Amino acid sequence: YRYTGKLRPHYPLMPTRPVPSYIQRPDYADHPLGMSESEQALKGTSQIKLLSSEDIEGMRLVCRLAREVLDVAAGMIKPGVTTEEIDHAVHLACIARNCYPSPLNYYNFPKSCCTSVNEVICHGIPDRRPLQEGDIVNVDITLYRNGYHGDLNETFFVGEVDDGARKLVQTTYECLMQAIDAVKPGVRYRELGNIIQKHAQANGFSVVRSYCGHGIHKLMHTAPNVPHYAKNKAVGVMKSGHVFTIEPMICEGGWQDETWPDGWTAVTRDGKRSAQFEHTLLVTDTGCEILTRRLDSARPHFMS
């Protein structure tokens, strides 16, 4: 394999971490290939669940706990900390909240969160590499509680970064928030990509095509598929009671991705940096409830 940038995986990985049996487990947790029969049973359907009030309570709780876990990870970000160390802390924080770390064994993903450094677009695997001053790192958290998943991520600075990193991460965050600000009943899912690409392109960045936002609730990934690029063909119309994520990946160079031999790590083909932010959103009768928002602080960690 020809690496696209300066990053390399740092093996070996620690043996998979167990989750105590008292924590409730999603269907894929015990499938040998980590397949989710409940997701597969709805493959290729574009119908979107309308959440009940019990379903809304469950999503509110799990998304609030997921934010708490992201915040734990944010508190660990500094030069010298390895991504596996971050993942270990995340793992324990999930368990402390009686939640299962959704990514763990999801189609055999080996860790409890994703850590994506510099040219890693998404799904980086936590490993023995210490964070370097100047790096940018996304931690993506997903938790499962009482049958509901909640999903969010943020990109962080490691010590001091360069202006390019500041601009990339800021614009990325703005893309997410401009899309969120448009969410309300009656908006076509396909419109979000128009808004995202327009701001990314105005700042000289591209928009990753291969990965989309997604419905989320009882299933981790389900309808709707939410592309983040312009003139996409996403199916469907927002309605009060819909829950889904938006998670734009924006890159300094070109939009093309490829995947490491590990089967997960997605990297820019040119080796230039990518940034991402994600929230889980509930469409209300008039707008959007950001289920994964911070409750106690005005801004994302990188602006704090």
Ligand SMILES: N[C@@H](C1CCCCC1)P(=O)(O)O
């Ligand atoms: N949270 C991410 C996943 C969740 C399942 C395993 C891989 C990481 P996403 O759905 O790509 O935002």
Ligand SMILES: [Co+2]
């Ligand atoms: Co995520």
Ligand SMILES: [Co+2]
């Ligand atoms: Co997601």
Ligand SMILES: [K+]
């Ligand atoms: K990255």
